[PDB]
Amino acid sequence: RIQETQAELPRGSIPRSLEVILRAEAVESAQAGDKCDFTGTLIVVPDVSKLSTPGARAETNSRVSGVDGYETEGIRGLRALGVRDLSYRLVFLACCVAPTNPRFGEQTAESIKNQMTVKEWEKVFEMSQDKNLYHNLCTSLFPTIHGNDEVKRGVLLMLFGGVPKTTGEGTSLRGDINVCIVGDPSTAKSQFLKHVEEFSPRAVYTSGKASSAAGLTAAVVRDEESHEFVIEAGALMLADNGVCCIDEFDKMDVRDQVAIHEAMEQQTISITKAGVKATLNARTSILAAANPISGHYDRSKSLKQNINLSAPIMSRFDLFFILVDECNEVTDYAIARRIVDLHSRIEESIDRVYSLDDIRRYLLFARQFKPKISKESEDFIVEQYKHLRQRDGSGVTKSSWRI
Amino acid sequence: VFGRWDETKGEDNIDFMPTILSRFDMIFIVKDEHNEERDVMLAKHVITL
Amino acid sequence: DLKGHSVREWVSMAGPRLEIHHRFKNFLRTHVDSHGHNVFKERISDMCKENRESLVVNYEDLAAREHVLAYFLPEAPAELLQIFDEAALEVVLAMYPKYDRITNHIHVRISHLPLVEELRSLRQLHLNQLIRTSGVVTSCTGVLPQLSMVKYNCNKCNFVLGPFCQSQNQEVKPGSCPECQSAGPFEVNMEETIYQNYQRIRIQESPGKVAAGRLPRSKDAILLADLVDSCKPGDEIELTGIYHNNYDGSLNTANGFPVFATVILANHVAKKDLTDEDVKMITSLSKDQQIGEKIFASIAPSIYGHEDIKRGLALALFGGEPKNPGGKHKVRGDINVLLCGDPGTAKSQFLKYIEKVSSRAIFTTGQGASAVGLTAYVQRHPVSREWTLEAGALVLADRGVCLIDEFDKMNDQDRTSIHEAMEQQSISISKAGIVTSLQARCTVIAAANPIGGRYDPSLTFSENVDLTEPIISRFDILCVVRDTVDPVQDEMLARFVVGSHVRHHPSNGVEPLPQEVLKKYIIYAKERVHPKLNQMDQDKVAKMYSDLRKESMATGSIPITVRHIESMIRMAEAHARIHLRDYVIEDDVNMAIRVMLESFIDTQKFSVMRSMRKTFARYLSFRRDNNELLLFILKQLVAEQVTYQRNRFVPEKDLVDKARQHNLSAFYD
Amino acid sequence: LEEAAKEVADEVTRPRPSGEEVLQDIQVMLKSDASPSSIRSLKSDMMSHLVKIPGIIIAASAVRAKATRISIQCRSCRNTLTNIAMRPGLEGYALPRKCNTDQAGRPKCPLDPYFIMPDKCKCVDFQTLKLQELPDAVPHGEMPRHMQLYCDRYLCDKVVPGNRVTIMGIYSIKKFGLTRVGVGIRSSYIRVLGIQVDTAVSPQEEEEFRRLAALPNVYEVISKSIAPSIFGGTDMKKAIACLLFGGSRKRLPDGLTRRGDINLLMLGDPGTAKSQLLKFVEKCSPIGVYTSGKGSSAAGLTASVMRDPSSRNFIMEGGAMVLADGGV
Ligand SMILES: Nc1ncnc2c1ncn2[C@@H]1O[C@H](COP(=O)(O)OP(=O)(O)OP(=O)(O)O)[C@@H](O)[C@H]1O
Ligand SMILES: Nc1ncnc2c1ncn2[C@@H]1O[C@H](COP(=O)(O)OP(=O)(O)O)[C@@H](O)[C@H]1O
Ligand SMILES: Nc1ncnc2c1ncn2[C@@H]1O[C@H](COP(=O)(O)OP(=O)(O)O)[C@@H](O)[C@H]1O
Ligand SMILES: [Mg+2]
Ligand SMILES: [Mg+2]
Ligand SMILES: [Mg+2]
């Protein structure tokens, strides 16, 4: 079942959803959330319609009349004449499938290298070798937002993710990075989330309480064509291996908060519904945006006293970025110049060192790498954690949240 | 209400309404008196059980 | 042989059928283990010895010996399996002519098929072929009696139409009654009929194998009279069977397109996963005389430090001795534990390790994101569609451990349920028409966070934990897992964590007992040794109790109660069980007293906590080699110095003075 | 065996009084001392055999009426086929498609002439129960197994849902004329032959109680007997005994009743064994329920009445107060 893309919706309309049929090689070539491009032929399929209004009967052309006691009247006569309703549905028969926007022109780094063409591969290699690639990626990914360089860097690291691992006893070591943005109104939090979505594939949006638990995680519906059950994917599922952007997170309901907490913690979703059980891996990275209680971030309080998120949900976040509106004339001038230049020169004023598609390809190529921790790196890590914990000692000014 | 009787409070240590307290035929106040002999006897009895 | 037409008809034809029967009989009778050992002789010997009805043939061996049969098997598996069953029955009867009265049928289970197909790759090409796949059993129906050789009663003249082979494709519908020739209604004669056990399972692609953003595909499999109960929901299995297509499912009801619901007739299931020499060796381990320390160090090998928590968990795992004077004074034998701690203290890891080790260990959470729940209800199950009395996670561990995470974030009903379970060890349902009281005698290991997310010793444990006093009282051990910025501890913990990460990267003072040995030790200790309290110093313990009470009301603190002495008795019994003594020895009593004290002291505020620690240091210092005490004193002195320095910007005398409060050469070396 | 029981009953009650001449059927419920077998042990091998199973009841349908003997009449000739035996258990019956009447050369009766005569039928009680694998008997990670039970004529309303029972019955299948994926599977059940519930004063016991009351220090005997294992609190134990025995409940001529029950409150420090005293009193009272202030796990402190939207019945969920009626 596919539905019309947002780029084609008429005003005030609900997207049209139709079922397309894949046969033979293409049978499993389309997966949920993909922006596919089905090529084939439209067709009609006879329908057992529930319309109570009779319409378009089809019957025999042979003129036959029932004899006394067997008159062609009623169900008997309808059956004898072979009357059947001609009710149809429109169904699409797709011979080939392909993504609307190809990323390149099992999975492994060598597989990605082979899949991508020579020019794309050389572009990925040259940008990987390029210096200050960190700043280049941040700027090219957020060319309209001013400041918040820490937030840009954190979101970029979230996009690149970590290296998931499994311990010998079975316990898994989560490698996905969770980022949350708390701050004053009109601080570009939603702008960061929308940038992330419009850039990253497998990136989904949700708002405070515009989503239900079933629509956020998964639902189960029987397959009308057989005895099986289809799982309709939720936002976390469609973002699996990608990003779920939860704006107005603080307003999300308690049940949805529990569901998202479970997804962030165990990276799996369990459904025991509609006659079927199923566990589905949800390797989503969560980018959340929340508003402090009272709307403005009181700098004289901890994040626990500022935001309404529960303690487990707060803990499961790797990064917490605070964007407090500084009433500084210089910053206001910079923001105004950025915004006004954007609105003046729309096509121009956006010079990105790396194209968005090139960044997508490079990110896909890099996600396969699973860097290991060297011994000097481990020593440095323990030293840095030592410094971080020492920063939490008494005497020094209290921090927003502990270490 | 305070977790311990706290004889000093007198009656603030019970929050039951007079209507409710009238219902009960009998009311007992069980204060864990700490006579040393009773304490030793209680420990010995518990261990004996 | 190999000629003619498609394999199905080629092997259906008699000539080739008898030829292949003879070939398989020869293969069965003549086959070595690569060392001359006639494998099939011993296989059939043990099969008939244990009355198993199933002979497992290795496909690799079959291919090596007779390649024609191996090539034909994955093309027409039904006929080949029937032929193999007949030949195996003939050979088994020849070996044991008396075995005909046990089974009269032998199932040949193929094994180690070369190609392994994943559920997402099953197509119409693989229809009516033997395939090997791997998956996770999601649901599994009960064992159902399916008709195998069905006799029919003709309810017109009461004749008994003889047995008809109930195939797995279509219902067997008799024709006329041979006597009265009436095609009229027939009934199944259930007394004369013989049934084969039938089970239906669902296996889905394992989440690890599921890749990218693809959904896990599931398939239905059918188990027949020997594969039944060979798997349970959640088990990871490898299934070999016929990709069936044609039983009754074609969607002919015009509901839509003419698709066929395919099922897999399971032919061989291989799961992917009692104390005689065990009991021989665990007694020696008990006599080792350091078994208590060995166990305490073997608990939670992946968790650094927290020796007190590990010791308490060991005592809880081994449990106490329940008793009931007469039938009127029930006293639990379960040691309940409550780890209250600020974030980042491995409480969840402790609970998960206890889940992994303990048998009958069920993990529930104070949130609503758990497979089970604390409160029992009655409803139609989502999957089984069956009206079931879903008892709570307190009842699913009647004789085990309930691991209640986030114990501070429980609903009103959850709190009431846990109160009922802890105080009564029973759960009462009065729900639809079910008025029942079912026993839940679990040991509760709970994890909780303090009010505000940071334990404050200034206040007491009761007002730090965010729990009701009745709820707290029913816990024998209260582990205050405080977090402090201690240089050495932070460095060591960072080393541990980074090392675990390094060694688990995907591209790859006594020795702890191995985990399986610890499990078996626990089984034996809980099952056989039952410590008795005949030899315990009533005078000493009563004096300790009286002194503790006196010191309790000498300051403004929570008084000690008979509850604490009973918990100490339970812990003494637990230590005696750890050492298999069968009698609590004075050292066991002292260790139980040390645990009970440490807990009760930590439950107090700093003002009274330190006072009680100083007053009762005699008990707290038991089984301390006098090096840990000195190390802790040095650590507190250096912590005072470092907190002084960090704000403004140790001598031997202070250490010797605190030691006096005499030998420091051993500590230095 | 049931036929022989009928014969023996007739033999032993032959000279019955007028108005009760007709001999009545006899139900032989069979009970065994043998150890029961697990529900998981019920395999195809035991089908149609007398099996014994433990379980806990979770449902008990209403006592409907099922026909042991039916009578049918021909629509045309109005001749009867009285006393057609009905197979016991969940087994149906196909009506004849021909009229027996010895035709006198008239046009023959129609193809399907027989109609049931509900007036001329012998019907018996029949109840359908749901039995569940005992929670302890369930393997650690495993959903409980369920069985359906058929009860007839005295096995109906002998056990209410929630009871723990051992059932001796004929592991059977539904027989309704062999009419997705499961081919050859017929829903199974147990035609219960015997019910035992897992849990009346003799003259000897009455004499014992009478003499015990006649004892001089019966008060002291009872007071000590209540909680011997609880130290001290002699007055509290005396009060507990007074509560257990209760006063007299009286209905005055005007219709105003006076309660005989005694209500006792124990406000005390957490150390004392007041909860243990409550537990003993709950175990010791004839009818006794122990509950917290906020009720138990999935049980209420007081009754709650609701209306079923479908059947429009008044379902009264019984709390502790109503469940422990006439007791403590
Ligand atoms: N003592 C320790 N030794 C080794 N690893 C530890 C230790 N304490 C914590 N960790 C690790 O640090 C992280 C924090 O542990 P964990 O997630 O169990 O916290 P927690 O105590 O459950 O927290 P919370 O109560 O906030 O949920 C995990 O990776 C855990 O493996
Ligand atoms: N620091 C900034 N730099 C550039 N634009 C900004 C900045 N802060 C706010 N804006 C502008 O303000 C608008 C509203 O911000 P919004 O996304 O609503 O933030 P929030 O969701 O946190 O209120 C955005 O469209 C954005 O262009
Ligand atoms: N006077 C006593 N006699 C016998 N046992 C006692 C006494 N006081 C306390 N106990 C013991 O203390 C334990 C805890 O008592 P508990 O039932 O929790 O009372 P409370 O509900 O008031 O806390 C009980 O197991 C009980 O055996
Ligand atoms: Mg916003
Ligand atoms: Mg935790
Ligand atoms: Mg109590």
Ligand SMILES: [Zn+2]
């Ligand atoms: Zn016949």
Ligand SMILES: [Zn+2]
């Ligand atoms: Zn007739």
